[PDB]
Short mmCIF file of all heavy atoms in Angstrom, two decimals:
data_model
loop_
_atom_site.label_atom_id
_atom_site.label_comp_id
_atom_site.label_asym_id
_atom_site.label_seq_id
_atom_site.Cartn_x
_atom_site.Cartn_y
_atom_site.Cartn_z
N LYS Y 8 -6.78 39.80 -24.48
CA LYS Y 8 -6.25 39.82 -25.84
C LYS Y 8 -6.95 38.80 -26.74
O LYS Y 8 -6.33 37.81 -27.14
CB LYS Y 8 -4.74 39.57 -25.83
CG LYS Y 8 -3.98 40.43 -24.83
CD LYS Y 8 -2.49 40.51 -25.13
CE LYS Y 8 -1.89 39.16 -25.50
NZ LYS Y 8 -0.41 39.14 -25.33
N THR Y 24 -25.81 34.60 -23.25
CA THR Y 24 -27.25 34.40 -23.33
C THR Y 24 -27.78 33.82 -22.01
O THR Y 24 -27.09 33.06 -21.34
CB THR Y 24 -27.61 33.47 -24.49
OG1 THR Y 24 -29.01 33.18 -24.47
CG2 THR Y 24 -26.82 32.16 -24.44
N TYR Y 26 -30.24 31.73 -21.94
CA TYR Y 26 -30.84 30.45 -22.30
C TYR Y 26 -29.73 29.42 -22.45
O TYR Y 26 -29.47 28.90 -23.54
CB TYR Y 26 -31.68 30.59 -23.57
CG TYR Y 26 -32.61 31.77 -23.48
CD1 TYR Y 26 -32.39 32.91 -24.24
CD2 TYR Y 26 -33.67 31.77 -22.60
CE1 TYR Y 26 -33.23 34.00 -24.14
CE2 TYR Y 26 -34.52 32.85 -22.49
CZ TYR Y 26 -34.29 33.96 -23.27
OH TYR Y 26 -35.13 35.04 -23.16
#
Side-chain angles (χ1 to χ4, degrees):
Chain Y
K8 312 198 316 200
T24 175
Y26 311 109

